[PDB]
């Protein structure tokens, strides 16, 4: 599930690095 806000904010930050 991608609907965990914590999973999304974490999903989005690694894509910087």
């Amino acid at each position, epitope marked *: 599930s991608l609907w965990n806000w914590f999973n999304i*904010t974490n999903x989005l930050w690694l894509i910087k690095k």
Partner: antibody, heavy 131, light 109 residues
Framework: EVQLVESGGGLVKPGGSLRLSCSAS????????MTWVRQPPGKGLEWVGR??????????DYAAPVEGRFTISRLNSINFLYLEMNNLRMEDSGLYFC??????????????????????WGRGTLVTVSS | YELTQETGVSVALGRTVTITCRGD??????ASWYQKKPGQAPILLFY???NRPSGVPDRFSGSASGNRASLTISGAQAEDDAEYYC????????????FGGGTKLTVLS
């Protein structure tokens, strides 16, 4: 359009218990994050705890001096937020608010899990704890 | 409280004033400001990088630099005499939120 009404507050002996209720209307209550915030007398605001939406499995985070004693729950069917309080101390006084928590996270500068802001508030209900 | 504000700041009528909020977590996280009047519910004034909610006048503006977050009120009016609190994460990467010591704005009307 957004409406918030707290209730269930009053006087109570130390170590006692009390359950505060909060009704909501004028928005999508089922997916909205909710947060309880208190203001001790003569002092400023103090973050109590937050209940999440369906996407997070209704997970609940409490404060350090609060956890292990309080319990937050919600009824999306009747749109009611509840704050169960056990082993009440005198420091838990006096006023309690419920607020509609928003979610913010800038992609280029934000840091997970981002930040939480509060869009709407209620009048709050007074909870006095004395012996 | 790991977020620190001014105890009390005063300002003349129709002039600019800037309150600040200090904390280690602010280096990684933004801060949201709220106006508090006695016997009244708080009101969201500003949050994030540059987001002002509707209904809030344009004289309220926020900023962030290092471990400090500031709220500037250019041309403060008489009714701005109130209490203000900044909210953010307690620690860098924490799921918990926390407010500041609170600042009393004294508008000499």
């Amino acid at each position: 359009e957004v409406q918030l009404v707290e209730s269930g507050g009053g006087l109570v002996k130390p170590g006692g218990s009390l359950r505060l209720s909060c009704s909501a209307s004028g928005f999508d209550f089922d997916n909205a994050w909710m947060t309880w915030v208190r203001q001790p007398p003569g002092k400023g605001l103090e973050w109590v705890g937050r209940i999440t939406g369906p996407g997070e499995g209704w997970s609940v985070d409490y404060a350090a001096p609060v956890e292990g004693r309080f319990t937050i729950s919600r009824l999306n069917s009747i749109n009611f937020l509840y704050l169960e309080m056990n082993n009440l101390r005198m420091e838990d006084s006096g006023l309690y608010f419920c607020a509609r928590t928003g979610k913010y996270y800038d992609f280029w500068s934000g840091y997970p899990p981002g930040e939480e802001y509060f869009q709407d508030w209620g009048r709050g209900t007074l909870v006095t704890v004395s012996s | 409280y790991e977020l620190t504000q001014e105890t009390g700041v005063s300002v003349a009528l129709g002039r600019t004033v800037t309150i600040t909020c200090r904390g280690d977590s602010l280096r990684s996280h933004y801060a949201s400001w709220y106006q508090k009047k006695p016997g009244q519910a708080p009101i969201l004034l500003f949050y994030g990088k540059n987001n002002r909610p509707s209904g809030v006048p344009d004289r309220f503006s926020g900023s962030a630099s290092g471990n400090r977050a500031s709220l500037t009120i250019s041309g403060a009016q008489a009714e701005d005499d109130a209490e203000y609190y900044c909210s953010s994460r307690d620690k860098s990467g924490s799921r918990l939120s926390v407010f500041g010591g609170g600042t009393k704005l004294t508008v000499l009307s």
